[PDB]
Structure 1
């Protein structure tokens, strides 16, 4: 078979290209190539994809499409009685590092499983023990700090915890924490930290994120 090919030099929207293909061929399910720059395309860069429908009625078209771009981004969309919905772009991720680096291990570098330049955002996870126990537990779970990668020398994960069981004599206590990290190529470094108690705090996971 012959997938639908849509060029900018055709001077035809994506939507009219799909209509014309279905008029000409009667196909309801088929693949397609759309050159980057085609008006109404699921995306800006070139893409390929799959159009799915069951009735080739181009006056009231009902169908969906699933397209992938040159950077791997996934875009899905629909047409409902010949009205085209806004294409939906998915995010993606890759787990780059997991382990347990004490906040006290400043100036230490570890590897990422891919280069940080393949990501626009990142999630850095930290795992804490609060100054005091609250209902017998000082553990916090593992907390996400999400950043946009803006070229900073330091990505700063800084926050606070309340902990302790209130008595009439002693309210809960408050504490501040920080860990700063940096990225370079396929590596990351724990640059700085501040801890307000004697317990060990860790960086435990780094996840690369794309939101194309």
Structure 2
């Protein structure tokens, strides 16, 4: 029992390890106050915690587990950081600086769901994702083009992102333009338009429709599943 002021875990009377800070909604205390009370009682400076979901001022709304790090137990001018992980695996970080508490920074996360080269003309084609779309809140769709004319001898665009929120639409619409060519006296640079429409269902995606203003081949090439929790 005499080492626990330095160590990440408490010791229960049966000798079992546990967290030294537990915070429950029944305690009627904010996450900030629970930390201050905990340092005042123990003199611990680096320690682990459980916060129950719905605790006010918690790093996140769900229950979370995390680590608080500090070097000096002065609650009248506290300086320190925490890193917390949710029950959904979200990551959040935050800090306290002269006892003032910073807004909790939530990290986004991603998985590559599909890659390849699906032509815009391949309408009615379905392909497998590496995961279910319901494990995401946002999607990036990527498209790779050739312009109608060449500018300084090149017609490639590089591979262009389209980011969407997953609102439950039956089509997600990638659409845009290019300017192409070199301006001569007789020939201005041309303008073109493009579209591709996609849909998602579980672990699958479908190329629904398109429009192309030249005879070259335009492709859908990457789908990334994004969480911004």
- The aligned length equals 212
Q: How far does the alpha carbon of each residue in 1:116-147 deviate from its partner, in whole angstroms, 9 at most, with x for none? A: 01111100000000000000100000000000
Query: Would the aligned equivalents of 2:46 and 2:71 in 1 still touch at CA under 8 Å?
Result: yes
Structure 1: which 4+ aligned runs deviate by more than 2 Å? none
Match of 2:159 in 1: 142
Q: Contact conserved, 2:19 with 2:50, CA < 8 A, in 1?
A: no
Q: Cα RMSD (Å) of the superposition?
A: 0.8
Q: Distance in 2 between matches of 1:41 and 1:164?
A: 56
Cα shift at 1:21: 1.1
Cα distance, 1:158–1:2 mapped onto 2, change above 3 Å? closer
The structure with more radius of gyration: 2
TM-score, structure 1 length as denominator?
0.98
Structure 2 residue runs of 5 or longer lacking an equivalent are: 1-17
Q: Give secondary structure in 2 for the equivalent of 1:50.
A: strand
User: Any conservation in 1 of the 2:146–2:156 contact (CA below 8 Å)?
Assistant: yes
CA drift of 1:93 comes to 1.0
Q: Residue 197 of structure 1 corresponds to which residue in structure 2? A: 214
Match of 1:93 in 2: 110
Deviation at 1:23, TM superposition (A): 1.4
Deviation at 1:71, TM superposition (A): 1.4
Long gaps (5+) in structure 1:
none
Aligned with 2:186: secondary structure? coil
Aligned-partner Cα distance in 1 for 2:198–2:42: 56
1:2 CA displacement:
3.3
Structure-1 separation of matches of 2:20 and 2:115? 43
